[PDB]
Symmetry: C3
Protein backbone atom coordinates (compact mmCIF):
# COMPACT_ATOMS: atom_id res chain seq x y z
CA UNK A 1 0.00 0.00 0.00
CA UNK A 2 0.85 3.67 -0.36
CA UNK A 3 -1.87 5.62 1.49
CA UNK A 4 -2.10 9.39 1.85
CA UNK A 5 -0.67 9.03 5.32
CA UNK A 6 2.34 7.23 3.84
CA UNK A 7 2.90 10.06 1.34
CA UNK A 8 2.75 12.73 4.04
CA UNK A 9 5.16 10.54 6.02
CA UNK A 10 7.60 10.52 3.08
CA UNK A 11 7.50 14.30 2.63
CA UNK A 12 8.10 14.66 6.37
CA UNK A 13 11.12 12.34 6.16
CA UNK A 14 12.56 14.24 3.18
CA UNK A 15 12.46 17.42 5.27
CA UNK A 16 13.83 15.90 8.47
CA UNK A 17 16.67 14.23 6.56
CA UNK A 18 17.55 17.57 4.97
CA UNK A 19 17.73 19.24 8.38
CA UNK A 20 19.72 16.41 9.95
CA UNK A 21 22.29 16.54 7.16
CA UNK A 22 22.55 20.33 7.47
CA UNK A 23 23.55 19.85 11.10
CA UNK A 24 26.10 17.38 9.73
CA UNK A 25 27.89 19.42 7.06
CA UNK A 26 30.84 20.26 9.31
CA UNK A 27 31.13 17.07 11.36
CA UNK A 28 33.09 13.81 11.11
CA UNK A 29 33.87 10.88 13.43
CA UNK A 30 35.74 12.31 16.46
CA UNK A 31 39.03 10.43 16.10
CA UNK A 32 40.71 9.06 19.20
CA UNK A 33 44.46 8.97 19.73
CA UNK A 34 46.56 6.40 21.54
CA UNK A 35 47.07 3.86 18.79
CA UNK A 36 43.43 2.75 18.70
CA UNK A 37 41.95 1.44 15.46
CA UNK A 38 38.20 1.47 14.79
CA UNK A 39 36.21 -1.40 13.29
CA UNK A 40 32.48 -1.20 12.57
CA UNK A 41 29.94 -3.99 12.18
CA UNK A 42 26.50 -2.43 11.98
CA UNK A 43 25.87 -0.78 15.35
CA UNK A 44 28.70 -2.72 16.96
CA UNK A 45 32.00 -0.87 17.20
CA UNK A 46 35.35 -2.22 18.29
CA UNK A 47 38.47 -0.28 19.32
CA UNK A 48 41.71 -2.26 19.08
CA UNK A 49 45.14 -1.31 20.42
CA UNK A 50 48.40 -3.26 20.54
CA UNK A 51 51.08 -2.83 23.20
CA UNK A 52 54.11 -4.76 24.42
CA UNK A 53 52.98 -8.39 24.51
CA UNK A 54 49.32 -7.44 24.68
CA UNK A 55 46.26 -6.68 22.61
CA UNK A 56 43.49 -4.55 24.08
CA UNK A 57 39.95 -4.52 22.65
CA UNK A 58 36.98 -2.32 23.56
CA UNK A 59 33.55 -3.23 22.23
CA UNK A 60 30.33 -1.23 22.36
CA UNK A 61 26.93 -1.12 20.65
CA UNK A 62 25.13 2.18 20.02
CA UNK A 63 21.64 0.67 20.34
CA UNK A 64 19.80 2.07 23.37
CA UNK A 65 22.85 3.87 24.78
CA UNK A 66 24.86 8.42 24.03
CA UNK A 67 26.75 6.61 26.81
CA UNK A 68 27.01 2.94 25.67
CA UNK A 69 28.13 0.21 28.07
CA UNK A 70 31.49 -1.08 26.88
CA UNK A 71 33.48 -4.27 27.25
CA UNK A 72 37.24 -4.30 27.68
CA UNK A 73 39.19 -7.39 26.68
CA UNK A 74 42.86 -7.71 27.55
CA UNK A 75 44.76 -10.53 25.88
CA UNK A 76 48.36 -11.32 26.81
CA UNK A 77 50.29 -12.88 23.94
CA UNK A 78 51.50 -15.63 26.30
CA UNK A 79 48.11 -17.36 26.19
CA UNK A 80 46.18 -16.01 23.22
CA UNK A 81 43.08 -18.15 23.84
CA UNK A 82 42.37 -16.56 27.23
CA UNK A 83 41.46 -12.96 28.06
CA UNK A 84 40.53 -10.81 31.04
CA UNK A 85 37.15 -9.24 30.30
CA UNK A 86 35.81 -6.18 32.12
CA UNK A 87 32.25 -4.97 31.49
CA UNK A 88 32.11 -1.19 32.04
CA UNK A 89 29.13 1.19 32.39
CA UNK A 90 28.46 4.91 32.85
CA UNK A 91 30.68 8.80 39.02
CA UNK A 92 32.00 8.90 35.46
CA UNK A 93 32.90 5.34 34.32
CA UNK A 94 32.91 2.13 36.35
CA UNK A 95 33.71 -1.57 36.21
CA UNK A 96 30.56 -3.66 36.70
CA UNK A 97 31.79 -7.22 36.04
CA UNK A 98 35.14 -8.97 35.59
CA UNK A 99 35.97 -12.49 34.41
CA UNK A 100 38.20 -14.59 32.20
CA UNK A 101 36.73 -15.72 28.86
CA UNK A 102 37.91 -17.64 25.81
CA UNK A 103 39.08 -15.42 22.95
CA UNK A 104 36.90 -15.22 19.85
CA UNK A 105 34.33 -17.26 21.76
CA UNK A 106 31.26 -17.98 19.63
CA UNK A 107 29.17 -16.87 22.62
CA UNK A 108 29.49 -16.02 26.32
CA UNK A 109 30.26 -18.64 28.96
CA UNK A 110 28.20 -17.88 32.07
CA UNK A 111 29.88 -20.80 33.83
CA UNK A 112 33.14 -18.87 34.26
CA UNK A 113 33.59 -17.16 37.61
CA UNK A 114 32.34 -13.60 37.23
CA UNK A 115 33.23 -11.04 39.88
CA UNK A 116 30.51 -8.50 40.51
CA UNK A 117 31.85 -5.19 41.81
CA UNK A 118 28.58 -4.35 43.57
CA UNK A 119 29.95 -6.25 46.56
CA UNK A 120 33.69 -5.82 46.03
CA UNK A 121 36.66 -4.67 48.10
CA UNK A 122 37.55 -1.05 47.34
CA UNK A 123 41.26 -1.85 47.15
CA UNK A 124 40.73 -4.59 44.55
CA UNK A 125 38.37 -2.33 42.59
CA UNK A 126 40.99 0.45 42.49
CA UNK A 127 43.77 -1.86 41.28
CA UNK A 128 41.51 -2.99 38.43
CA UNK A 129 40.94 0.66 37.52
CA UNK A 130 44.74 1.21 37.68
CA UNK A 131 45.16 -1.90 35.51
CA UNK A 132 42.90 -0.44 32.82
CA UNK A 133 44.50 3.01 33.03
CA UNK A 134 47.99 1.54 32.42
CA UNK A 135 46.53 0.24 29.19
CA UNK A 136 44.85 3.41 27.96
CA UNK A 137 41.37 2.85 29.34
CA UNK A 138 40.79 5.79 31.66
CA UNK A 139 38.34 8.66 32.13
CA UNK A 140 39.69 10.49 29.08
CA UNK A 141 39.19 7.37 26.96
CA UNK A 142 35.67 7.05 28.40
CA UNK A 143 34.80 10.69 27.65
CA UNK A 144 36.11 10.23 24.10
CA UNK A 145 34.15 6.98 23.64
CA UNK A 146 30.96 8.88 24.56
CA UNK A 147 31.68 11.50 21.88
CA UNK A 148 32.40 8.83 19.29
CA UNK A 149 29.37 6.73 20.18
CA UNK A 150 27.18 9.83 19.97
CA UNK A 151 28.55 10.71 16.54
CA UNK A 152 28.07 7.15 15.29
CA UNK A 153 24.52 7.23 16.61
CA UNK A 154 23.54 10.39 14.75
CA UNK A 155 24.90 9.12 11.44
CA UNK A 156 23.18 5.76 11.77
CA UNK A 157 19.99 7.58 12.69
CA UNK A 158 20.21 9.52 9.44
CA UNK A 159 20.89 6.34 7.48
CA UNK A 160 17.88 4.84 9.23
CA UNK A 161 15.60 7.73 8.23
CA UNK A 162 16.64 7.18 4.61
CA UNK A 163 15.97 3.45 4.81
CA UNK A 164 12.59 4.24 6.35
CA UNK A 165 11.79 6.68 3.54
CA UNK A 166 12.61 4.12 0.85
CA UNK A 167 10.53 1.50 2.67
CA UNK A 168 7.42 3.64 3.16
CA UNK A 169 7.84 4.80 -0.43
CA UNK A 170 7.93 1.24 -1.85
CA UNK A 171 5.00 -0.96 -2.99
Amino acid sequence: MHTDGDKAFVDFLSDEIKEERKIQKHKTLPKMSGGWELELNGTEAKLVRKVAGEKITVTFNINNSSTPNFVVEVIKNDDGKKALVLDCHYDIFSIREVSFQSTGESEWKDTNYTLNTDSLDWALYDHLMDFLADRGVDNTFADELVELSTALEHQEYITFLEDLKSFVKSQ
Copy 2:
Protein backbone atom coordinates in the same frame (compact mmCIF):
# COMPACT_ATOMS: atom_id res chain seq x y z
CA UNK B 1 6.42 -41.59 43.79
CA UNK B 2 2.77 -40.97 44.75
CA UNK B 3 2.47 -39.42 48.21
CA UNK B 4 -0.45 -38.41 50.41
CA UNK B 5 0.44 -34.86 49.43
CA UNK B 6 0.07 -35.78 45.74
CA UNK B 7 -3.46 -37.15 46.24
CA UNK B 8 -4.53 -33.93 47.96
CA UNK B 9 -2.95 -31.99 45.08
CA UNK B 10 -4.90 -34.04 42.52
CA UNK B 11 -8.08 -33.53 44.55
CA UNK B 12 -7.54 -29.76 44.42
CA UNK B 13 -6.87 -29.70 40.67
CA UNK B 14 -9.84 -31.83 39.56
CA UNK B 15 -12.28 -29.32 41.00
CA UNK B 16 -10.22 -26.22 40.19
CA UNK B 17 -10.20 -27.21 36.53
CA UNK B 18 -13.99 -27.71 36.46
CA UNK B 19 -14.57 -24.39 38.23
CA UNK B 20 -12.26 -22.65 35.76
CA UNK B 21 -13.90 -24.22 32.71
CA UNK B 22 -17.33 -23.16 33.96
CA UNK B 23 -16.49 -19.51 34.61
CA UNK B 24 -14.43 -18.56 31.55
CA UNK B 25 -16.96 -20.50 29.48
CA UNK B 26 -19.05 -17.40 28.78
CA UNK B 27 -16.75 -14.90 27.07
CA UNK B 28 -17.59 -16.80 23.86
CA UNK B 29 -13.96 -16.05 22.99
CA UNK B 30 -13.19 -12.46 21.84
CA UNK B 31 -13.43 -11.78 18.11
CA UNK B 32 -11.33 -9.11 16.44
CA UNK B 33 -12.24 -6.93 13.48
CA UNK B 34 -9.88 -6.35 10.58
CA UNK B 35 -9.76 -9.90 9.26
CA UNK B 36 -6.80 -11.08 11.34
CA UNK B 37 -6.06 -14.79 11.64
CA UNK B 38 -4.70 -16.23 14.87
CA UNK B 39 -1.77 -18.60 14.38
CA UNK B 40 -0.98 -19.96 17.82
CA UNK B 41 1.88 -22.16 19.06
CA UNK B 42 1.90 -22.77 22.78
CA UNK B 43 2.06 -19.33 24.42
CA UNK B 44 3.26 -17.58 21.27
CA UNK B 45 0.47 -15.94 19.32
CA UNK B 46 0.64 -14.37 15.87
CA UNK B 47 -2.09 -12.28 14.28
CA UNK B 48 -1.64 -12.18 10.53
CA UNK B 49 -3.18 -9.94 7.90
CA UNK B 50 -2.50 -9.09 4.26
CA UNK B 51 -3.20 -6.00 2.16
CA UNK B 52 -2.13 -4.84 -1.28
CA UNK B 53 1.59 -5.58 -1.50
CA UNK B 54 2.04 -6.28 2.21
CA UNK B 55 1.91 -8.85 4.98
CA UNK B 56 1.27 -7.59 8.51
CA UNK B 57 2.09 -9.75 11.53
CA UNK B 58 1.61 -9.01 15.21
CA UNK B 59 3.39 -11.30 17.65
CA UNK B 60 3.05 -11.57 21.41
CA UNK B 61 3.68 -14.15 24.14
CA UNK B 62 1.11 -14.54 26.90
CA UNK B 63 3.78 -15.43 29.48
CA UNK B 64 4.40 -12.75 32.11
CA UNK B 65 1.75 -10.61 30.41
CA UNK B 66 -0.19 -9.86 33.60
CA UNK B 67 0.93 -6.69 35.46
CA UNK B 68 -6.71 -10.87 35.65
CA UNK B 69 -6.11 -8.92 32.44
CA UNK B 70 -3.35 -9.68 29.96
CA UNK B 71 -1.48 -6.70 28.45
CA UNK B 72 1.55 -8.29 26.68
CA UNK B 73 4.19 -6.40 24.77
CA UNK B 74 3.64 -7.03 21.10
CA UNK B 75 5.81 -6.80 18.02
CA UNK B 76 4.46 -5.54 14.72
CA UNK B 77 6.24 -6.74 11.58
CA UNK B 78 5.42 -5.04 8.28
CA UNK B 79 6.69 -6.75 5.14
CA UNK B 80 6.66 -5.14 1.70
CA UNK B 81 6.20 -7.97 -0.80
CA UNK B 82 8.66 -6.40 -3.27
CA UNK B 83 11.34 -7.15 -0.69
CA UNK B 84 10.28 -10.04 1.51
CA UNK B 85 13.96 -10.17 2.43
CA UNK B 86 13.46 -7.71 5.29
CA UNK B 87 10.74 -6.08 7.38
CA UNK B 88 10.05 -3.01 9.47
CA UNK B 89 9.69 -4.16 13.10
CA UNK B 90 7.93 -2.14 15.79
CA UNK B 91 8.12 -3.24 19.43
CA UNK B 92 5.02 -1.98 21.22
CA UNK B 93 3.68 -2.16 24.76
CA UNK B 94 0.94 -1.06 27.13
CA UNK B 95 1.90 1.94 29.31
CA UNK B 96 1.58 1.15 33.03
CA UNK B 97 -8.85 9.06 29.56
CA UNK B 98 -6.78 12.05 28.43
CA UNK B 99 -7.46 13.19 24.88
CA UNK B 100 -3.75 12.64 24.19
CA UNK B 101 -3.75 9.11 25.61
CA UNK B 102 -3.08 6.02 23.52
CA UNK B 103 -3.84 2.47 24.62
CA UNK B 104 -0.36 1.40 23.52
CA UNK B 105 2.94 3.00 22.55
CA UNK B 106 5.87 2.18 20.28
CA UNK B 107 9.12 1.63 22.19
CA UNK B 108 11.53 0.58 19.44
CA UNK B 109 11.65 0.46 15.66
CA UNK B 110 14.13 -1.25 13.35
CA UNK B 111 14.63 -3.21 10.15
CA UNK B 112 15.21 -6.95 10.55
CA UNK B 113 15.58 -9.78 8.05
CA UNK B 114 12.44 -11.89 7.71
CA UNK B 115 12.51 -15.26 9.45
CA UNK B 116 15.97 -14.54 10.86
CA UNK B 117 17.70 -16.72 13.44
CA UNK B 118 17.05 -14.10 16.11
CA UNK B 119 16.89 -10.34 16.71
CA UNK B 120 20.03 -9.09 14.95
CA UNK B 121 21.86 -6.94 17.51
CA UNK B 122 23.99 -5.10 14.96
CA UNK B 123 20.91 -3.68 13.20
CA UNK B 124 20.06 -0.07 14.03
CA UNK B 125 17.28 0.15 16.61
CA UNK B 126 15.52 3.47 17.18
CA UNK B 127 14.43 4.05 20.78
CA UNK B 128 11.30 6.25 20.92
CA UNK B 129 12.07 7.88 24.31
CA UNK B 130 13.53 11.14 23.04
CA UNK B 131 11.99 10.83 19.58
CA UNK B 132 10.74 13.77 17.53
CA UNK B 133 6.98 13.96 18.15
CA UNK B 134 5.96 14.43 14.51
CA UNK B 135 7.96 11.34 13.51
CA UNK B 136 6.33 9.34 16.29
CA UNK B 137 2.89 10.50 15.17
CA UNK B 138 3.68 9.32 11.63
CA UNK B 139 4.75 5.90 12.92
CA UNK B 140 1.45 5.60 14.77
CA UNK B 141 -0.43 6.60 11.58
CA UNK B 142 1.58 4.10 9.54
CA UNK B 143 0.51 1.36 11.96
CA UNK B 144 -3.09 2.58 11.97
CA UNK B 145 -3.31 2.47 8.15
CA UNK B 146 -2.43 -1.22 8.46
CA UNK B 147 -5.04 -1.93 11.11
CA UNK B 148 -2.90 -1.60 14.21
CA UNK B 149 -4.75 1.12 16.11
CA UNK B 150 -6.16 1.69 19.62
CA UNK B 151 -9.22 -0.45 18.88
CA UNK B 152 -6.88 -3.24 17.78
CA UNK B 153 -4.76 -2.86 20.92
CA UNK B 154 -7.98 -2.98 22.94
CA UNK B 155 -9.16 -6.17 21.25
CA UNK B 156 -5.68 -7.66 21.66
CA UNK B 157 -5.99 -7.29 25.43
CA UNK B 158 -9.34 -9.11 25.28
CA UNK B 159 -7.90 -11.92 23.17
CA UNK B 160 -4.68 -12.34 25.16
CA UNK B 161 -6.75 -12.43 28.35
CA UNK B 162 -9.00 -15.18 27.00
CA UNK B 163 -5.94 -17.08 25.75
CA UNK B 164 -4.30 -16.72 29.15
CA UNK B 165 -7.29 -18.34 30.89
CA UNK B 166 -7.59 -21.14 28.35
CA UNK B 167 -3.91 -22.03 28.60
CA UNK B 168 -4.01 -21.76 32.37
CA UNK B 169 -6.75 -24.41 32.38
CA UNK B 170 -4.69 -26.65 30.09
CA UNK B 171 -1.74 -26.14 32.42
CA UNK B 172 -3.74 -27.39 35.41
CA UNK B 173 -4.80 -30.39 33.34
CA UNK B 174 -1.22 -31.27 32.37
CA UNK B 175 -0.24 -30.73 35.99
CA UNK B 176 -3.04 -32.98 37.29
CA UNK B 177 -1.97 -35.66 34.82
CA UNK B 178 1.63 -35.22 35.97
CA UNK B 179 0.89 -35.56 39.69
CA UNK B 180 -1.68 -38.31 39.19
CA UNK B 181 0.83 -40.63 37.47
CA UNK B 182 3.02 -42.97 39.53
Copy 3:
Protein backbone atom coordinates in the same frame (compact mmCIF):
# COMPACT_ATOMS: atom_id res chain seq x y z
CA UNK C 1 53.57 -5.75 29.37
CA UNK C 2 54.32 -5.55 33.10
CA UNK C 3 54.14 -2.10 34.73
CA UNK C 4 54.81 -0.88 38.26
CA UNK C 5 51.06 -0.80 38.77
CA UNK C 6 50.92 -4.45 37.73
CA UNK C 7 53.68 -5.26 40.24
CA UNK C 8 51.82 -3.61 43.11
CA UNK C 9 48.60 -5.33 42.00
CA UNK C 10 50.28 -8.75 42.17
CA UNK C 11 51.66 -8.09 45.67
CA UNK C 12 48.24 -6.90 46.81
CA UNK C 13 46.68 -10.10 45.43
CA UNK C 14 49.19 -12.30 47.27
CA UNK C 15 48.16 -10.79 50.60
CA UNK C 16 44.48 -10.77 49.63
CA UNK C 17 44.73 -14.49 48.81
CA UNK C 18 46.50 -15.48 52.04
CA UNK C 19 43.83 -13.66 54.06
CA UNK C 20 40.96 -15.42 52.26
CA UNK C 21 42.58 -18.84 52.68
CA UNK C 22 43.35 -18.13 56.31
CA UNK C 23 39.67 -17.32 56.86
CA UNK C 24 38.33 -20.22 54.80
CA UNK C 25 40.49 -23.25 55.67
CA UNK C 26 38.68 -24.35 58.84
CA UNK C 27 35.64 -25.96 57.23
CA UNK C 28 35.07 -28.51 54.47
CA UNK C 29 32.52 -28.40 51.65
CA UNK C 30 29.24 -28.76 53.63
CA UNK C 31 27.22 -31.89 52.89
CA UNK C 32 23.61 -31.98 51.67
CA UNK C 33 21.57 -34.53 53.58
CA UNK C 34 19.04 -36.59 51.66
CA UNK C 35 21.32 -38.53 49.33
CA UNK C 36 22.02 -35.74 46.83
CA UNK C 37 24.87 -36.17 44.36
CA UNK C 38 26.83 -32.98 43.57
CA UNK C 39 28.13 -32.11 40.12
CA UNK C 40 30.11 -29.01 39.15
CA UNK C 41 30.45 -27.18 35.84
CA UNK C 42 32.50 -24.10 36.62
CA UNK C 43 30.23 -21.84 38.67
CA UNK C 44 27.23 -24.04 37.83
CA UNK C 45 26.28 -26.67 40.37
CA UNK C 46 23.80 -29.50 40.00
CA UNK C 47 22.48 -31.64 42.86
CA UNK C 48 20.86 -34.89 41.74
CA UNK C 49 18.60 -37.28 43.59
CA UNK C 50 16.68 -40.36 42.56
CA UNK C 51 13.47 -41.43 44.28
CA UNK C 52 10.86 -44.09 43.60
CA UNK C 53 9.85 -43.50 39.98
CA UNK C 54 11.51 -40.14 39.44
CA UNK C 55 14.61 -38.00 39.31
CA UNK C 56 14.96 -34.66 41.07
CA UNK C 57 17.65 -32.14 40.18
CA UNK C 58 18.42 -28.70 41.54
CA UNK C 59 20.60 -26.32 39.54
CA UNK C 60 22.14 -23.01 40.58
CA UNK C 61 25.02 -20.72 39.58
CA UNK C 62 27.18 -18.96 42.16
CA UNK C 63 27.57 -15.96 39.86
CA UNK C 64 25.52 -12.99 41.05
CA UNK C 65 24.39 -15.09 44.03
CA UNK C 66 25.34 -12.46 46.62
CA UNK C 67 31.56 -13.52 55.45
CA UNK C 68 29.61 -12.84 52.25
CA UNK C 69 26.54 -15.09 52.09
CA UNK C 70 25.42 -16.72 48.84
CA UNK C 71 21.65 -17.19 48.33
CA UNK C 72 21.24 -18.11 44.63
CA UNK C 73 18.05 -18.60 42.68
CA UNK C 74 17.75 -22.31 42.06
CA UNK C 75 15.84 -24.35 39.52
CA UNK C 76 14.20 -27.62 40.47
CA UNK C 77 13.33 -30.21 37.84
CA UNK C 78 11.11 -33.19 38.66
CA UNK C 79 11.16 -35.98 36.08
CA UNK C 80 8.65 -38.85 36.14
CA UNK C 81 9.79 -42.17 34.70
CA UNK C 82 6.27 -42.47 33.25
CA UNK C 83 7.03 -39.60 30.86
CA UNK C 84 10.72 -38.80 30.82
CA UNK C 85 10.30 -36.37 27.92
CA UNK C 86 8.70 -33.62 30.03
CA UNK C 87 9.87 -32.09 33.27
CA UNK C 88 8.07 -29.93 35.79
CA UNK C 89 10.36 -26.97 36.37
CA UNK C 90 10.21 -24.67 39.36
CA UNK C 91 12.36 -21.55 39.56
CA UNK C 92 12.98 -20.69 43.22
CA UNK C 93 14.81 -17.98 45.12
CA UNK C 94 15.41 -16.48 48.56
CA UNK C 95 13.28 -13.34 49.14
CA UNK C 96 9.49 -19.43 55.10
CA UNK C 97 13.04 -19.55 53.70
CA UNK C 98 12.58 -19.71 49.94
CA UNK C 99 9.81 -19.13 47.44
CA UNK C 100 8.69 -20.22 44.00
CA UNK C 101 8.79 -17.57 41.29
CA UNK C 102 7.67 -19.55 38.25
CA UNK C 103 6.56 -23.02 37.19
CA UNK C 104 6.19 -24.75 33.83
CA UNK C 105 6.83 -27.96 31.93
CA UNK C 106 10.00 -28.06 29.83
CA UNK C 107 11.54 -30.71 27.59
CA UNK C 108 13.90 -32.96 29.52
CA UNK C 109 17.52 -32.55 28.52
CA UNK C 110 16.67 -29.55 26.29
CA UNK C 111 19.66 -27.36 25.40
CA UNK C 112 17.75 -24.08 25.83
CA UNK C 113 14.67 -22.79 27.62
CA UNK C 114 11.46 -23.08 25.60
CA UNK C 115 9.55 -19.81 25.89
CA UNK C 116 6.48 -21.19 24.10
CA UNK C 117 5.54 -23.36 27.09
CA UNK C 118 2.98 -22.00 29.54
CA UNK C 119 4.89 -20.51 32.48
CA UNK C 120 3.03 -19.84 35.71
CA UNK C 121 4.13 -16.73 37.58
CA UNK C 122 3.50 -17.10 41.32
CA UNK C 123 3.23 -13.32 41.67
CA UNK C 124 -0.15 -13.63 39.95
CA UNK C 125 -1.34 -16.93 41.42
CA UNK C 126 -3.77 -18.12 44.10
CA UNK C 127 -2.24 -19.26 47.37
CA UNK C 128 -3.92 -22.68 47.20
CA UNK C 129 -1.94 -23.89 44.18
CA UNK C 130 1.20 -22.33 45.65
CA UNK C 131 1.00 -24.39 48.86
CA UNK C 132 0.40 -27.62 46.99
CA UNK C 133 3.48 -26.79 44.92
CA UNK C 134 5.60 -26.15 48.03
CA UNK C 135 4.35 -29.46 49.49
CA UNK C 136 5.14 -31.20 46.18
CA UNK C 137 8.72 -29.95 46.55
CA UNK C 138 8.92 -30.92 50.22
CA UNK C 139 7.80 -34.48 49.46
CA UNK C 140 10.70 -34.77 47.05
CA UNK C 141 13.46 -33.42 49.26
CA UNK C 142 13.31 -29.72 48.45
CA UNK C 143 12.24 -28.52 51.88
CA UNK C 144 13.38 -25.79 54.26
CA UNK C 145 16.27 -27.82 55.61
CA UNK C 146 17.38 -28.26 51.98
CA UNK C 147 17.30 -24.54 51.20
CA UNK C 148 19.26 -23.77 54.38
CA UNK C 149 21.94 -26.32 53.51
CA UNK C 150 21.94 -25.03 49.93
CA UNK C 151 22.91 -21.57 51.18
CA UNK C 152 25.86 -23.01 53.13
CA UNK C 153 26.98 -25.09 50.17
CA UNK C 154 26.66 -22.23 47.68
CA UNK C 155 28.47 -19.94 50.13
CA UNK C 156 31.36 -22.40 50.55
CA UNK C 157 31.59 -22.81 46.77
CA UNK C 158 31.44 -19.09 46.00
CA UNK C 159 34.27 -18.53 48.49
CA UNK C 160 36.54 -21.26 47.09
CA UNK C 161 35.92 -20.14 43.52
CA UNK C 162 36.56 -16.50 44.51
CA UNK C 163 39.99 -17.54 45.75
CA UNK C 164 40.73 -19.52 42.59
CA UNK C 165 39.71 -16.44 40.60
CA UNK C 166 42.15 -14.21 42.53
CA UNK C 167 44.92 -16.79 41.91
CA UNK C 168 44.01 -16.70 38.23
CA UNK C 169 44.02 -12.91 38.22
CA UNK C 170 47.37 -12.77 40.03
CA UNK C 171 48.97 -15.18 37.56
CA UNK C 172 47.56 -13.22 34.63
CA UNK C 173 48.80 -9.86 35.96
CA UNK C 174 52.16 -11.44 36.78
CA UNK C 175 52.50 -12.56 33.14
CA UNK C 176 54.34 -10.72 30.35
